[PDB]
Structure 1
Amino acid sequence: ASADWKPGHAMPSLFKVQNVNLERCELANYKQSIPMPRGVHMNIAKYMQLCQYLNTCTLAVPANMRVIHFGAGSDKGIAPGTSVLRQWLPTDAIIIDNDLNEFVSDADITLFGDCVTVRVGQQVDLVISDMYDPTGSNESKALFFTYLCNLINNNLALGGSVAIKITEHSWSVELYELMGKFAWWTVFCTNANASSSEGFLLGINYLGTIKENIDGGAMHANYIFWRNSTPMNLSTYSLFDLSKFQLKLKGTPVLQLKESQINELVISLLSQGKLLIRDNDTLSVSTDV
């Protein structure tokens, strides 16, 4: 059972190309929960498995890497996911995190309040979102998704990536369509939470231009069809060997370029995870009014 030793499952192109109606998500394992190794928060296992999958992706990993983490508060007032990011990322990476209510965190900067109050002054390299609102037919939601879509279009370095939590009912047409502006994309479901319709929508290496035309509503129907078609066993076996857990120290270069200078070579380097385009100044992410 190789898949149980993997960190989770990624939506294959076999289901990306389907054409189906949106159906209810019905998972065989429901209400079945996984025991947590060593009395550890479930979010430790979930974030670690997300990181392990991102280790197989062509992430750009520069010096002074800029990481923003939304929905970082959990388990009444703490942020295990942020601590996992600190364990995973380069020691010189900057972590900014955010959630509605107060919590204590190992981030470099922690901002409380609605994500709309997080003012990203300069483009970032990696966005992690676990935002989920607790609140009849399943239509595209708006909420913080409007904010995230705007962030991808404006505040994300070319070559940067995103990992954004969605579920059967918490999802956005526009966010699926923005995955078409990355070199590669998928939905990733951790083995630790495989009995939930949760998935992480992954956009790897932002290109700022449409590489794949995606019908967002159709693609969410494809995502549910995939979940309905795919046995996934709860498992944290991938965490049994952590000797290679940390993100590779790639030294990815950061270049400033005009849009007119972005040619075939640059698009190729961005698409392979070998380049970021953004400012190389010192970062500033503040609270708005």
Structure 2
Amino acid sequence: ASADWKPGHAMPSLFKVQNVNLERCELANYKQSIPMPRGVHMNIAKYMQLCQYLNTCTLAVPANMRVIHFGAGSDKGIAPGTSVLRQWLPTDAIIIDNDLNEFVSDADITLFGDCVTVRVGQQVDLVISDMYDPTTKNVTGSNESKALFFTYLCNLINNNLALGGSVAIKITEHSWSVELYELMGKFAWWTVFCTNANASSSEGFLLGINYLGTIKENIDGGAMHANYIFWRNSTPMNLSTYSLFDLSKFQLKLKGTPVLQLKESQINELVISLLSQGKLLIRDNDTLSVSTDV
């Protein structure tokens, strides 16, 4: 199947427009696993496939790109995804990563502790989150919207994300937020992307592409998660890493996206268009200051 050669599946508008109740997620191949190349952590493939999909998105890619990576650590004390980001991003990009527990990584800055301790002084260009709270596995009653780190992430999008920046935030059947789905409406475009390397999980990356700061689409977040689940339940996904055979074009395009400072009054239509096409970032151009607070 041709889809086996893609990095994964992106939620189609066919399911975005449905109106269904939230159902349980039942994947035919649930938790089945695919062998990886020898010694290669599965998260290498997961992050590479995510990056391959973002290569088809209108990502703003400036010099000194500001990237922050939450949930970058693991129980092995290492940071495979951060290394993929180092491989994927421009050499002059700044990676700040973070995790509750201690780890070591190839990021420029590494902050230990709860993501709420991470104080971002300036606006960033790209937010990756792979955070998941272990208590989410205690399924007791109804699957309701979750707070946890999503509160922090929602406030980040509203205050610390450049106009034109993008986010990729991990959700699962039970690890999701109404507010975060709603905020996808403030980007030029959005989807949920499921890697083929982990297609047997309800995991998906909630993607917001090119932040606009105003509401482009009014999204009922509770209903949209139900559509996401309806899509997962309707769509056969074969586990695969075939897309990683040809890595000749893996690196993120060096777009040289310009960074402008503008007042809200000066945005108008040309600027909005440039932001929506991944051709412009609006934010400060100072020195990035991302530290841990008390």
TM-score range, shorter chain: over 0.9
The alpha-carbon deviation at position 227 of structure 1 amounts to 0.1
Unaligned runs of 5+ in 2: 135-139
Q: Determine the structure 2 residue equivalent to 1:81.
A: 81
Distance between the aligned counterparts of 2:193 and 2:287, measured in 1?
32
Q: Which shifted more, 24-33 or 269-278?
A: 24-33
Residue deviations 1:223-249 (CA, integer Å, cap 9, x gap): 000000000000000000100000000
The alpha-carbon deviation at position 76 of structure 1 amounts to 1.4
The alpha-carbon deviation at position 30 of structure 1 amounts to 1.4
Using structure 2 for the length normalisation, give the TM-score: 0.98
Distance between the aligned counterparts of 1:119 and 1:277, measured in 2?
20
Distance between the aligned counterparts of 1:249 and 1:25, measured in 2?
39
Please state whether the residue corresponding to 1:97 is helix, strand or coil.
strand
Distance between the aligned counterparts of 1:100 and 1:275, measured in 2?
33
Distance between the aligned counterparts of 1:74 and 1:5, measured in 2?
28
Please state whether the residue corresponding to 1:101 is helix, strand or coil.
coil
Please state whether the residue corresponding to 1:171 is helix, strand or coil.
coil
Q: Determine the structure 1 residue equivalent to 2:270.
A: 265
The alpha-carbon deviation at position 282 of structure 1 amounts to 1.0
Please state whether the residue corresponding to 2:170 is helix, strand or coil.
strand
Unaligned runs of 5+ in 1: none
Structure 1 residue corresponding to 2:247, chosen from 242, 265, 268: 242
The alpha-carbon deviation at position 172 of structure 1 amounts to 0.1
The alpha-carbon deviation at position 75 of structure 1 amounts to 4.4
Please state whether the residue corresponding to 2:254 is helix, strand or coil.
coil
The alpha-carbon deviation at position 38 of structure 1 amounts to 2.5
Q: Percent identity?
A: 100
Residue deviations 1:49-83 (CA, integer Å, cap 9, x gap): 00000000000000000000000002410000000
Q: Determine the structure 2 residue equivalent to 1:139.
A: 144
Using structure 1 for the length normalisation, give the TM-score: 0.99
Alignment root-mean-square deviation, CA = 0.8
The size of the alignment, in residue pairs, is: 289
Distance between the aligned counterparts of 1:75 and 1:45, measured in 2?
18
Q: Which shifted more, 138-147 or 126-135?
A: 126-135
The alpha-carbon deviation at position 214 of structure 1 amounts to 0.1
Please state whether the residue corresponding to 1:280 is helix, strand or coil.
coil
Residue deviations 1:151-195 (CA, integer Å, cap 9, x gap): 000000000000000000000000000000000000000000000
Residue deviations 1:189-224 (CA, integer Å, cap 9, x gap): 000000000000000000000000000000000000
Please state whether the residue corresponding to 1:163 is helix, strand or coil.
strand
Distance between the aligned counterparts of 2:194 and 2:96, measured in 1?
24
Residue deviations 1:135-166 (CA, integer Å, cap 9, x gap): 91100000000000000000000000000000
